[PDB]
Every structure is written in C-alpha cells, then in structure tokens.
Design a protein around this ligand. Structure first.
Ligand SMILES: *[C@@H]1O[C@H](CO)[C@@H](O[C@@H]2O[C@H](CO)[C@@H](O[C@@H]3O[C@H](CO[C@H]4O[C@H](CO)[C@@H](O)[C@H](O)[C@@H]4O)[C@@H](O)[C@H](O)[C@@H]3O)[C@H](O)[C@H]2NC(C)=O)[C@H](O)[C@H]1NC(C)=O
Ligand code: CA
Ligand code: CL
Ligand code: CL
Lengths: 215, 138, 219, 125
C-alpha cells in the first residue's frame, strides 16, 4: 500500500501568517498527467471537508488563501494568511490505487505567548467516598503551549499507574489549553494518608509547582 | 436534449455518463469511479506477469460510449486470449481453454450488441464478436 | 444539495456484527460509487471499501479480512456497510463518503459512532468538585462536576440549564480500566457569587436515557 | 551531564540591542528544547523564550514578544537570544536552561550560571 507521511505532526502559526504542511508518499501518485493527491480539513465533531483536489485545484467555495502544490511523491498545502477558522487537522489522501490511504494528519493551531498554568486541586466528595472510591482532581487552567507534566504525590511518595488525564482543545477566546488529572484510590487507601499533591512542570515554569491539600 | 445529455423517459436533461468496469482482473484502473463524465479518461494497468492488450487509455464520448478497444490483462496461458469484459458488461466463465465458453450480459438500461456467448475455437480465436453495451439513448 | 445521512450510534459486544446505513439524496445515485471510511478517536482515517450501485460490485481494503460487506438498495438510494466479528479495536466513527469526478471524497455523511465493548450501557454517577480555598485565584473560584462510570459515549454537560457558558471547560472522556468512561466539567466564577448564586451541572446521557442535575456548593 | 555557559552580557543603553549566546558541552542538544530565563534583583525568575527543536517553533513571554528573538545553531551546539528595543526593566541576569524532556514538558535539569545585562544610561555618553 502507498504510505502517506505528513509533516509536521502539529504546528502553531500566528494569525495572518503563512502555514505550510507537507505530504510525502512512499509511491508516486502521478499517472496519466494528473497527481492523484487530495487535501481535507477536519474540525472536531465533523466529517473531513475536501479543500484541494488533484494536488493543486481549489474546490468551489474554499477561500483562495488555500493552495496546493507538488508532483509525484512530494506535496504541500499552504495557507497564505492564517485565519482563526483555519485551526483544524489537515489530511492528505491519494487516489492512485487501491486501497485509498490517508496521511496521519497535521494539527494546525493558533500561536500565542507562553502562559504557565494556574493549578487547582479538589478532594473527593463525601458522596463518592461513601460508595468506596476516592477521585482526586488536579486542574491546570489556561496555559500555553499544550505540553505539560503532572505528577501525583501522596504523603510525599510519587504515584504511578493510578491517574489519567485529559486536555481540552484550544480555547476559542484566549487560545490556551486546560488539563485535568484524576487520581483514583480506594476509600480505604484514601483515608490512610494525609497530604495529596499534584506537581506540575511546564516550559513556562522555571521549576515545578506543587498544589496540595491535607485530608 | 443537447449533445452529451439524455432525458428522463420519453421526450430532466441529465448528463451522459460512460459505464465503469464491473471488474478489471489482474490490474487496476484510475480514476476508479462509479461512472465517468463525457470527456473523462480511464487508464488501465496490469499486475506483474500479465500482458496489457487493448487500449491503455480510453476517453468517454458524448454518446456515452468509450473510444478505443477493451483493455484486458492476459497471462497468455489460455488456448485463446483473455476475451476481457467490455465496460458496462458482466461476464461468466473464467476458463480460456479449447472449447470453453463465456457468457455476457449488460447492466442497468444498457443494450447488448454483439455475441452474448463466445467459444474458444481450435485456431485460438474466440467465436462471434465482442459484445458492446450501448446506451439506450443514441 | 447533495446529502448523505447515516443511521444512529451503535453499541455492540465483541464477536457481534453491526450494519450501518447511508441514505443519499440530491444526485443520481447510480452515477457514483459509495465508499466507507472509519476514524478511531484521536486517530487517522482508514478506507474500508466501496460499492458501485450499477453492478453491486465491491472493492475492499484487505486489512479487514472479509469482515466488511457492502450492499445497496437502489430503490431507496441507500448503501449499507456490515462489519462482522467485531473487536474492541473496531470502535470508531464510520463514514460513508462519495467521490467526485476527480476521485476525491467531496461529500461525507455525518458519521456513525460504533462502540465495541463487553461493557453494558450504564448512566453516570455525578459528584461535585466543590469550590474552596484550593480552587481560588484572585477573585475567581473554580468548581465542577465529575461525571463517572458511564457507558458508552457521549454525555453532554451544561451548567445552570445552559444559562452559564463563559469559562466552562468540559474535558474529553477517558476510558477507565473498568471499561466505563469518566469526564470532568469545570467552570470559573467570581468568588463573591458563591454565597448567593447557585451552580448546577446538568448531565444528559442519551444511551442510558439518564438525566442528572447536581448542585455544586462550597463545603 | 550537560554544561551550559552563557556569554554576551554587558551595559547597553535604553533602546539598544544585544545578542546573548549559550554554548552546551557534554551532550548534543539538537534533540532538546533550550529556554532563556531571567532574574532581576529581588524578583522571581521569569520565563523569556524557548527554542524547541529545529522545525518545532519558538515561543515567547508577553513581556518580550516582538523585541526578543531566540534561535539555534545545532552544528555549534549553541542557542542565541537577540534582544532589541531594550528597556531598563529588562535589566537582569539571563540564564539558559535545557529541557531534558524531548516531549517538551519543561524538565529543566541543567542551567547556566547566567550573564548580566544592564540597561541604563549611566555609562553611555
Ligand atoms: C482526457 O484526456 C483528453 C486528452 O488529453 C483531454 O482533452 C484535452 O482537454 C483540454 C482541456 O479541455 C483541451 O484544451 C482545450 O481547452 C480549451 C480552453 O482553453 C482555454 O483555457 C485554457 C486554460 O484552461 C487556456 O490555456 C486557453 O488560453 C483557452 O482560453 C477548450 O475550449 C477546449 O474544449 C479544449 O478542451 C485539449 O484540446 C484536449 N485534448 C485532446 C487531445 O482532446 C481531456 O481534458 C481529459 N479529460 C479529463 C476529464 O481530464
Ligand atoms: Ca472512487
Ligand atoms: Cl482568503
Ligand atoms: Cl523552528
């Protein structure tokens, strides 16, 4: 099968500036005078939308800040002047042979200045505790870039294997992210310990910050 | 209707489309569509160990017929050549030795012209004529 | 103009089969193949197969190993995709997609979520994430709801029946080792409002036909 | 075990320009993000800028956006901070640090000793 490799996997671009995404095919998609490579945009909760067909042709209704170029195996999608509505995942796709295959996707986000997270913590509710389980939640609010590390400590012992985390998409108003990390323990283990802490690392912090409570 | 369009029964003037291959054994064709616009081209390619006979590139004409000759991927192992499947037709019978036979039918509203059955003769030639699925209009 | 409309979300056990429908309108159905494409969550797009309505002939991605069967019913302009011997890895959004004359996917259905799991359908438990001195910064306080142990996706969370939208962050669900989902929704509000304004999170889980309202107040 | 050394500090007048360097030894830094921080007397250490891997972008604090530029020379194992339109409040010790996390979470394990930048009219004619 033809393998399509897109680069970068993600990129942050300032509004008004040029964005370029590349797609490299392991086999030529060119035959009969046409390059059978197409580009799509996808936003959350929606199907992909066709933007560019046969490498360089704009579909009707697509703004002309979008363009495509390349031939053979190497293709590029360019947005000449990024606008807020252009934040999305972009996919290349060939139609040279079966199976049709897609690139892995390139996430295009809006660049802004660095913001370290505001860190909050929530003990389990008494209602949950009665049912036998304790969820402790650490919230990292309104930070940029997305990459961050959260570590849980319980009476100063580092934890592993008993937390999960989730991150929002970029906020439509301030272009930041928020993240939640949830530590899950049995009621019995929760009541054996006093201090519950989340340590947060982020490129905008000179050292990690810790938020904690005493049970 | 004007040239390159066909009406609803009797007399919506819809565009003519040429028929896609039902199958193209031991090869591929591009673009792979359900039907093809007037002026569109289809290009055929064979897999390893096969000979491409017929027209490698065919264009869809305004009367809904393809130009050129039916493409086929032939391994040359038969007593007769691979008779192919003309575009719009379906074929039954996949043995090409002496005495073997194939049968053809068209699809949708297409009108079969030519031999609906052909036998592999002693001199290596298929009997009859190639079936061609013509558009009912035109 | 052209519209492709798919059947609703499905939940299946491993080993079962699922059949997804795609009704086409706005064009001559037999002019074009219908294709099927799937996407796992946070993952890429994978082509399944296609069918030509003129012949009912098909092509398939070999990776599915004959598990996918495509059919059409021309009388109602509908295409179907049946995927058998389902695995949890088949959990995905399934799309019907229709080519244009350039063999690009110009038209797509809305997508159908198929969840493949041994879990049984269950409504969430909803617990408060109470504001406190540990969730305050400046004059603002964060508070929320933990929506735990439901199956399948999705849940919808609103605050004060949708009367509160600014500052809300509803996180993507995580799948727990139990096979049930969990998510949190949080909102930031003025600390001065905590003594006078009530805050309720409204959780709607359509697969279990459950609705829960939870008041969130300081301890 | 990475050694970082900043250079380029000095006395510049307001509105002036200056380029700092940070050279690394004991490890090739091309796989790692490199950040600049600064600390003025009696104030907390502040983030300035990060240069991720070549092709992954550069990101800035609000306080320096538009005026400062970070860049890298991977062949020289060096990163740079170009500083324009300097203000007296940019006076600080400027530090470089390596993010040891290739996934960019900000695990700043090794730091330079810093270089002094003083923005003042005092020793300029
Ligand atoms: C299938 O293959 C066929 C053979 O290669 C293709 O036929 C060719 O099609 C092109 C385009 O239709 C023909 O060129 C002509 O173009 C003029 C218009 O030209 C004006 O615009 C062009 C830019 O597009 C500009 O350069 C000029 O200044 C003009 O003002 C049309 O009026 C004609 O219809 C004609 O189409 C070639 O003549 C034609 N070649 C052959 C050998 O017939 C066909 O396009 C392919 N089909 C598909 C769907 O790809
Ligand atoms: Ca197709
Ligand atoms: Cl535009
Ligand atoms: Cl870069």
């Amino acid at each position: 099968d033809n393998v399509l490799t897109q680069s970068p996997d993600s990129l942050a671009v300032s509004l008004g500036e040029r964005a370029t995404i590349s797609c490299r095919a392991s086999k030529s998609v060119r035959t009969s005078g046409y390059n059978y490579m197409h580009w799509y945009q996808q936003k959350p909760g929606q199907p992909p939308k066709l933007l560019i067909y046969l490498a360089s042709n704009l579909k009707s209704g697509v703004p002309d800040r979008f363009s495509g170029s390349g031939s053979g195996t190497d293709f590029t999608l360019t947005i000449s002047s990024l606008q807020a509505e252009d934040a999305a995942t972009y996919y290349c796709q060939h139609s040279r042979e079966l199976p049709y295959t897609f690139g892995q996707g390139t996430k295009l986000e809006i660049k802004r200045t660095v913001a370290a997270p505001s860190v909050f913590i929530f003990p389990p509710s008494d209602e949950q505790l009665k049912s036998g389980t304790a969820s402790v939640v650490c919230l990292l609010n309104n930070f940029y870039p997305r990459e961050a590390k959260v570590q849980w400590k319980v009476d100063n012992a580092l934890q592993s294997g008993n937390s999960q985390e989730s991150v929002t998409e970029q906020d439509s108003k301030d272009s930041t992210y928020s993240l939640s990390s949830t530590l899950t323990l049995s009621k019995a283990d929760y009541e054996k310990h006093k201090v519950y802490a989340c340590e947060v690392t982020h490129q905008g912090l000179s050292s990690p910050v810790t938020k904690s409570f005493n049970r | 209707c004007p040239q390159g369009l066909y009406p609803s029964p009797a007399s919506v003037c819809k565009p003519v489309r040429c028929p896609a291959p039902v199958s193209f054994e031991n090869g591929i064709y591009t673009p792979r569509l359900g039907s093809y616009p007037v002026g569109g081209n289809v290009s055929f390619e064979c897999e390893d160990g096969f000979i491409l006979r017929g027209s490698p590139v065919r264009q869809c004409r305004p009367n809904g017929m393809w130009d050129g000759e039916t493409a086929v991927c032939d391994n040359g192992a038969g007593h007769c050549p691979n008779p192919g499947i003309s575009l719009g037709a379906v074929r039954t019978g996949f043995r090409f030795g002496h005495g073997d036979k194939v049968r053809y039918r068209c699809s949708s509203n297409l009108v079969l012209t030519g031999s609906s059955e052909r036998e592999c003769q002693g001199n290596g030639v298929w009997s009859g004529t190639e079936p061609i699925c013509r558009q009912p209009y035109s | 103009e052209v519209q492709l409309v798919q059947s609703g979300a499905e939940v299946k056990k491993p080993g079962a089969s699922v059949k997804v429908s795609c009704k086409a309108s706005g064009y001559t159905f037999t002019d074009y193949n219908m294709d099927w494409v799937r996407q796992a969550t946070g993952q890429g797009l994978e082509w399944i197969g296609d069918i030509n309505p003129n012949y009912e002939s098909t092509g398939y991605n070999q990776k599915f190993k004959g598990r996918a069967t495509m059919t059409v019913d021309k009388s109602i302009s509908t295409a179907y995709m049946e995927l058998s011997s389902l695995r949890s890895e088949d959990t995905a959004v399934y799309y019907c997609a229709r080519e244009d004359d350039h063999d690009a996917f110009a038209y797509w259905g809305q997508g159908t979520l198929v969840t493949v799991s041994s879990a049984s359908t269950k409504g969430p438990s909803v617990f408060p994430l109470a504001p406190s001195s540990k969730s305050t910064s400046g004059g603002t306080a964060a508070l929320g709801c933990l929506v735990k142990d439901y199956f399948p996706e999705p849940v919808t969370v609103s605050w004060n029946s949708g009367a509160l939208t600014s500052g809300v962050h509803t996180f993507p669900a995580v799948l727990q080792s139990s096979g049930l989902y969990s998510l949190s929704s949080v909102v930031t509000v003025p600390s001065s409002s905590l003594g006078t304004q009530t805050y309720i999170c409204n959780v709607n889980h359509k697969p279990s036909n459950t609705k829960v309202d939870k008041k969130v107040e300081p301890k | 075990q990475v050694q970082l050394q900043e250079s380029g500090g000095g006395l510049v007048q307001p509105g002036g320009s200056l380029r700092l360097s940070c050279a690394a030894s004991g490890r090739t830094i091309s796989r790692y993000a490199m950040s600049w921080f600064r600390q003025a007397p009696g104030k907390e250490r502040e983030f300035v800028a990060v240069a991720r891997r070549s092709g992954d972008g550069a990101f800035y604090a609000d306080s320096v956006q538009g005026r400062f530029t970070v860049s890298r020379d991977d062949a020289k194992n060096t990163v740079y901070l170009q500083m324009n339109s300097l203000k007296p409040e940019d006076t600080a010790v400027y530090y470089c640090a390596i993010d040891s996390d290739t996934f960019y979470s900000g695990s700043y394990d090794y730091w330079g000793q810093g270089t002094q930048v003083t923005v003042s009219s005092e020793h300029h004619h």
